[PDB]
Amino acid sequence: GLPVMNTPGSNQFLTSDDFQSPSAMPQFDVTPELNIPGEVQNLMEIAEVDSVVPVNNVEGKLDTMEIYRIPVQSGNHQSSQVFGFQVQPGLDNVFKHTLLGEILNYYAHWSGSIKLTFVFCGSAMATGKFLLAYAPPGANAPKSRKDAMLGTHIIWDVGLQSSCVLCIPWISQTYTSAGNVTCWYQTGIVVPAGTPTSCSIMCFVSACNDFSVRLLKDTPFI
């Protein structure tokens, strides 16, 4: 009874199908759920957390805590570069193994805004100024302190603030075609008698709320 007609696709196993299946243990009442703290609904809750960037990824110190410390030297060098990098999460070595980088490497297309925080870890007696500069994608990195001043920049006085924040708006993926960030000595570091001479800066990266990902794929790390 009930005349019926089989269509193409019958009796195939499609690895991504979605069908009701027969239970092998129907007479078994399951343990009820517990209210465990710390539940997750979405992977973007992991990428919105700050993590420390290994900005000092040069030879001889890829296996020490020193990889995370930007060196600030003593004396008068008030126009020299402190650091610089291209902003390319997912592809570039300095951003590749962070919490944000590890997520982005599961997807073939992504886009959003990024947040960078810088923190000064010197003694409370040290004072000085840094110049933090941002170049957009398609622009060359500045070569001097003066042309970095002629673009988008902030002047950061560490005797007043211990930390600075930046939000970068046009991030996508695929000799890069990406924006960059650089830091310059505006003045030099000045200390009283009896304080350590050298010091360090640390970088933290995170994602802002408008971040999106597409086309789940396999990661290239295991």
């Binding site: 092998a24 759920e33 465990i36 290994p54 890829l62 296996d63 990098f85 997807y107 650089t182 295991i222």
Partner: protein
């Protein structure tokens, strides 16, 4: 939307492939067996380790192919072959021969299937007297470090369903596994080192990331 937990974890994968004969002189080659856990599939293992506690149902599909052994005898005319796929819950009897009594126990759910039809499929619920599974356990079994007995999920066994004095044949089974209705708790950092064995977290020390030329180096812009 593609970063939700369900779209990230609920995907099918081949986790075990095994071979078994109808006649042999080893008697362990007469059936195939697998213990259910998610630690010998390296790509699923890593995605599962981003969380500390998990809860899911299982769906298992079986792809089964046969062959006449190249031994000698031709001109045969055989009906299609029948197979038995048995699931053993935690706390069940385990067979040791293909003629054992446990292949007939009323509380081990079982599937009977003959070749030529659609691939067989069973659905297993969340089976634990605890409230969630754990990917990480900082304890002792009662003594093995890192192993707790609440993570038992059962076993699968496959044999041929012939009568007496069968003809020689060799079969291969592939098991496709998929979690469903998933919930996760307490996110973790991603595994940075390669896995060494299937029961521990043992590892050899690894570099934090790869090097570049200097702390100022940015590649020339196109």
């Amino acid at each position: 939307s593609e970063s939700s937990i369900e779209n990230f974890l609920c995907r099918s994968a081949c986790v075990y492939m095994g071979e078994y004969h109808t006649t042999n002189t080893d008697t362990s080659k007469l059936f195939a067996s697998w213990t259910i856990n998610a630690r010998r599939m390296v790509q699923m293992r890593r995605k599962l380790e981003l969380f500390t506690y998990v809860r899911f149902d299982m769906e298992v599909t079986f792809v089964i192919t046969s062959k006449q052994d190249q031994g000698t005898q031709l001109g045969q005319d055989m009906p299609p072959l029948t197979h038995q796929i048995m699931y053993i819950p935690p706390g069940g009897p385990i067979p040791k021969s293909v003629t054992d009594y446990t292949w007939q126990t009323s509380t081990n759910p079982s599937i009977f299937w003959t070749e030529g039809n659609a691939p067989p499929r069973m659905s297993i619920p969340f089976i634990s007297i605890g409230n969630a599974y754990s990917n990480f356990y900082d304890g002792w079994s009662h003594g093995v470090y890192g192993y707790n007995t609440l993570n038992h999920m059962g076993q699968i066994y496959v044999r041929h369903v012939n009568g007496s004095s069968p003809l020689p044949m060799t079969s291969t089974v592939r098991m496709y596994f998929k979690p469903k209705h998933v919930k996760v708790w307490v996110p973790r950092p991603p595994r940075l080192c390669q896995y060494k064995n299937a029961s521990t977290v043992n590892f050899t020390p690894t570099n934090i990331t790869e090097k570049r030329q200097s702390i100022n180096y940015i590649p020339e812009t196109v």
